[model samples]
Target: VNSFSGYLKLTDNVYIKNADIVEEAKKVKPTVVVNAANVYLKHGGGVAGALNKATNNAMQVESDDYIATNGPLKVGGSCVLSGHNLAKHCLHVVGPNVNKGEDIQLLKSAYENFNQHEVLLAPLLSAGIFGADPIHSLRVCVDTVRTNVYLAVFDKNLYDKLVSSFL
Candidate 1:
């Protein structure tokens, strides 16, 4: 649990933390926990896997059912699923995949989709396996999230980079 713990205040409601997203979700008990999901809403690895573990894979079942009914979610699209044991809902947003020639606008849409909620916790969307530049992804999150959004960043190096460049 003691990896890296620090934060940068961007606004009264929006902030960034260098910690596990799952732990942050436990503490904040946000209205929704944003999952940086794939088009199929598969809780495979990374944040999705972590949340799946934390929620005892209950969210994964909902994701599966949702996908079964709605089909594959388009890139930059989103759907709200039951949070299981975490929060009120899980905001599943499919960010733009850089390898697919997707750009910042689609990434921005991912964040914007959750902006309506009163309180939410999300990681820096699309900056991991999605292959987005960390700083660029942070910029999109910073500009779009208008709610009480907590960015639970786990990478100490990337957190340091964000603090230096953003703060």
Candidate 2:
């Protein structure tokens, strides 16, 4: 229960090939992966779209059914799903929406919630069209890493920046 007392390091690399996010996640073999979406569970763009495509749209269907019953999410809440093809569990969190006042902290809350001994495959959150820059979320990921909870990232520029920032 001690913070980062376990033997751990964020095993990571740059996933440069533009491929299915599922495959990318699969390579990492994390206990869980992420589906960055909205309260409406729209997987129209970003990693969500890639996840939806790889799962043959099952992720979206499952998300819609869940969200319909749950109503809308509060700030910093996450919805967990069975990883259809990418991991043991699939994490869904609402990204920033200025219309709804969703802050960037919501991004880190989900990351913190999903913990495992192995890697937690993550999407470069809020790095898309309308949210905050990728670096903020990436910074959160790096900062959030714990020895008890391991993770991995695969973006050259991302890790390059992360490495430089630390030393």
Candidate 3:
């Protein structure tokens, strides 16, 4: 997660407010970026607003593909599975500890001058805290990119238990 704290660069004077992942993504030049901050978890507003922002930005900016990023689980498994379910391609980005400022930078760079079909999934495990509950984290990640990309969320336990997984 890249970080950089400052008022939004847009002319509308709309303060970032809560720093919705989608809102930060709009600042990206070529691609869109999203982040799940600790504050986001505390607020617990979920990713609805971020999704709307991403969708609207995609429509307005004519973006072809949408990108989403997140941190990994403590169990040391795959974070992409959940993010992929929510957004487009899940990009796993490795970085040092990220603060609010750094997150904004990483996302901005990821989106700037990015091309479609590129690896869009970023799993940043070394950043900030993602809060408890995989489902909640997945929700925020998915909703953030739902607008610019296709998202899918599933019950991991159920899938693991299902014998006819392919069917």
Give me the overall lDDT of model 3. 0.28
Top candidate on lDDT is 1
lDDT of 1 at 139: 81
lDDT of candidate 3 over 1-167, digit per residue (tens)? 22334422211111121233443343432232332322212212234334334454332122122122332222211122122223442332222223322343233223221223232322222223332333332233332332232111223352233223212
Clashing pairs in 2: 15-154
CA lDDT, candidate 2, residue 87: 75
Positional deviation of residue 167's Cα in model 1 after best superposition, in angstroms: 6.1
- Candidate 3's C-alpha runs over 4 A off are 1-18, 29-45, 56-167
- Residue by residue across 45-110, what tens digits does model 1's lDDT show? 888999999988888888888878989998888998887777778888899878778776788888
Candidate 3 has what TM-score? 0.22
For each candidate in turn, the TM-score is: 0.89, 0.70, 0.22
Q: In candidate 1, which residue pairs get closer than 3 Å at backbone N, Cα or C atoms, i.e. clash?
A: none
Runs of candidate 2 with Cα error greater than 4 angstroms are 1-20, 98-101, 116-118, 145-159
lDDT of each: 0.81, 0.60, 0.28
